[PDB]
């Protein structure tokens, strides 16, 4: 419809561009991904693992990725500036493991030969914002230890490790646990803390799954025993709370059908999260989201990138 | 940029592949090292000593290694075909001593238990070019004696011993001195000489540190007294001088920041060393290097292995 | 503290002297300015306006200037090779207006009288790189119009005029706006464009402040009404982008405390600007600066000129 | 749960849960139906939740805790619970909207307990219904908005 | 390279490189590891060397060349896998001297590939070492010289 006339009739304002990360706001980059191009990327359900992916669909600045050899029911959407996708050949050049297409074996797979056999085009390197050609996030080296909130069970702060580093980001892993609980972040993340923070704050720390003698959990000796260092405290930066206010309007991907983006409103706020309401829909579909999530955008993003915008219902 | 267009504009040639050791030139081997893998290797500053190391970073055919338990400030870069790294378990199986992770005790350390406690993966054996599964360098047995140039003080030729043998290489140690002056080489090394060479050449020989009666230094009796044999003269092979010429171009690691490799030129030559100039930089950063050094490579090495190449400044 | 030890410690490289303009690098010129000397110069905050200034302090190749008759809170620092200062008499010989000392009238000020009143010495002419004696910038005449980026609001490209010409540079003024927005440039400045550039690039052009019909600004009519000519298109030159790279280290004056010069790093780059980070300080103090700005310098500049250098936090 | 008095102001005091932060704390008076003397759970047959990280939580015992902490129990006699309120289902009133506290709306008693009422906002979904203490400061008799100069939101 | 069968004698055939000197020709059998069917380079992503003086060197195409030349490809079924040899480094044997072929010398396996071995003459410089196919007629087991009546040269 038009944002302009909507704002007049509702007597409302949009969340200003300045409130968003540059990466959530940028509209002027073209999407150079094309149908059938091949690449590598993380599995959103197993964020430590990398698979061969194909571009199955492009919509504006977004793309839908298919896991080669597997079912289309696993396909998922990302933005073209996603740091979670990488060019063909990246895994080998940066020390990562590639899970091959269904029916291959890790060491059976070669990009040269795969491309010959498929006659497919690898997505060109220059498309990717993350190629491990930037120097890491200061002070966060693989194997180092920290305390982290289990984003799945937010009342728990837990023994955790850095297991992956890529450009300005690193992977937080829970000791003795599935990669299912892992998550990517950067040194300003509000979900991470230096070794000792729990003790110094009052809260209990959850030790590694099936550790010997859990209440008697000692960090400086866990550390000596694992040949690990804790991430230095000077490394952990303070992300300031976001400045979104209740009733500001924006555009947000609909988690019920991620192909769609909708007119939305800020229904509530915490320091680092906002509660999203889709205008014209039930408050039952209202949901909490991290302010820095890739799937929230300023008003006009859809229009400038060429993605349909769902008007209010 | 491109080598091709650079060579045309400069009216220059690259040092041909044939000029390099196969090990400096090989691009077609993949790097199978992955972040967090554990292994063993020498300390580049104390080349007689072995430590537990972790893969901290991978770039193309290179990797950055971290000393477990110690500071990240000691991390160092090697190539994936380095003979100075070995699989977990190597020390025990080949008669070498392992200095354990900071806070352990030599005999407190067990790989089984370390891996259980860290939940880490040992780098697979098949990755390593040096596992002591080759028969030694002919005629160079541990305890044997020779004359060697102190690569740190090149005007000195000195009483020296073989103290380590691994595959085709052996460790040259200076009698009564720190391991700080030690270096690895092979029987074609131009820095080593049979017992008597000094006397037969005219030059003075430096005896062991704090030996009784230095000018009166007698080899055949030093020998009888130490229950040692000299390395037999037939063992010392003649490495021919290299064939690099001034102005040939190549790629070379920048010692100021070893993460980087640069376009370079041959500025000068000796029989077994070349002087490297980084195109577009001051001649003040020009440096001498052994022709067989692992950190010089033919043009196109970076491109074929997936390591960034710094173009001329 | 030394640069040599710090670079080894950090595995870092300094920006070479070759990347700087000669004027930013030159260390072998002596500072002839002495305490109490009087001269003329622009107010850095209002670069179209000239004042009587006195040397209040000298530090290496830098000097602090004081606005005669005004508060010391307005003192500012320049290099001894600044083109923004001029000898006594220059204003009257070159058609520039003097803002006289606090409490004088323009017609009231005479250098002869003032020097007699104060018993002070004028800075000698031979100190000054700029006396309006060198050939003017080709094609840029006073009164000619052009399109310019508002460096204070860089999203705006605006109707502007040449209002001053001194040696090889000219002053860009934004029609009917505060002179605080004015800036000095040369023909290669990346911030200026010929009349018609916005329309050819499809960018909005910002019209003069209080333009009688803001809606329908037309350059052809404006030029006619104002008795003005466009700067001809041939006069505009391409400045090549700078060659500074992220992580190179250098020396930069502290914007908050300009008496101080600090160890600095290149945090980010654009074609014509660099982003400065002060090593050891918060990235909150980081700032963008033009590559040609007179207050960045190569490592070594402070020690070679005799200016103290502040080590990293 | 095991609790302490940590603040006293006029006739009210602050109930704090030992070893927990203050996010679960609440202010009340001697007649609160939510407070009981030390020993109440044992006398009534209800399980007692020990402090958040108490060492041997299965063997938590009050007479030992009181001696490790040098504290005494609020005297049993001080607890004088209030009678149940007399709000009946269907009675109407005004109540602050929890989701937008600037607004007061027409309301109904949907359901009752001894000390609480279940508020329903007239014309709205029953999914919006909530339980609230009968002494809560944000419920009011009909006419309160009109008499105090606050707008009332009509049903729907 | 593009090549042709130009001779057949008993169980072997001669491989010839189209329009090159016949000095490059060699005899083989179907299991030779040096030959591949038409299309192998393109399937393996290797450059194929075209005939010498091929009229348009740039755009060599097998389909057109076969047609222009009235020729058929050797069918793919005819090519057999030869298993790699089982010689190991340091095994000793007898080998004819390439420089003085009248002579057979004590020799050692210096290095191995799947189908070749590198010969070292014991007591001589490694500068005289050479690669040779495992099936070459001029290497023999220890004892061959004495059992056939050929003199054997001992190590330097």
Curated annotation (Swiss-Prot), chains A, B, C:
Task: Summarize subunit and interaction data from the UniProt record for this chain.
Answer: Homodimer. Interacts with RB1/RB (when monomethylated at 'Lys-860'). Interacts with p53/TP53 (when monomethylated at 'Lys-382'). Interacts with CBX3, ETV6, KMT5A and VCP/p97.
Extract the signal peptide range: none
The part of the entire sequence present here spans 274 to 586 of 840
User: Where is the site Mediates recognition of monomethylated and dimethylated peptides?
Assistant: 150
Task: Name the reported effect of residue 174 to A.
Answer: Abolishes binding to monomethylated and dimethylated peptides. Abolishes binding to p53/TP53 monomethylated at 'Lys-382'
Impact upon substituting residue 181 to L: Abolishes binding to p53/TP53 monomethylated at 'Lys-382'
This molecule's function is given as: Polycomb group (PcG) protein that specifically recognizes and binds mono- and dimethyllysine residues on target proteins, thereby acting as a 'reader' of a network of post-translational modifications. PcG proteins maintain the transcriptionally repressive state of genes: acts as a chromatin compaction factor by recognizing and binding mono- and dimethylated histone H1b/H1-4 at 'Lys-26' (H1bK26me1 and H1bK26me2) and histone H4 at 'Lys-20' (H4K20me1 and H4K20me2), leading to condense chromatin and repress transcription.
Compartment(s) of residence: Nucleus
Q: How is it modified after translation?
A: Ubiquitinated in a VCP/p97-dependent way following DNA damage, leading to its removal from DNA damage sites, promoting accessibility of H4K20me2 mark for DNA repair protein TP53BP1, which is then recruited to DNA damage sites.
Instruction: Tell me more from the record.
Output: The L3MBTL1 locus is imprinted. Paternal inherited gene is expressed, while the maternal inherited gene is silenced.
Q: What is this protein called?
A: Lethal(3)malignant brain tumor-like protein 1
Task: Provide the effect of residue 177 to L.
Answer: Abolishes binding to p53/TP53 monomethylated at 'Lys-382'
Q: Where is this region: Interaction with monomethylated and dimethylated peptides?
A: 174-181
Where exactly is the site Positioned at the entrance of MBT 2 and is required for recognition of monomethylated and dimethylated peptides?
153
Start and end residues of the MBT repeats are: 1-101, 109-208, 217-312
The set of disulfide-linked cysteines is none
Per the entry's comment, what about the domains? The MBT repeat 2 specifically recognizes and binds monomethylated and dimethylated proteins. In contrast, it does not bind trimethylated proteins. The MBT repeat 1 does not bind methylated peptides but inserts a proline ring in a Pro-Ser-Ser/Thr sequence context.
* Tissue occurrence: Widely expressed. Expression is reduced in colorectal cancer cell line SW480 and promyelocytic leukemia cell line HL-60.
Biological source species: Homo sapiens
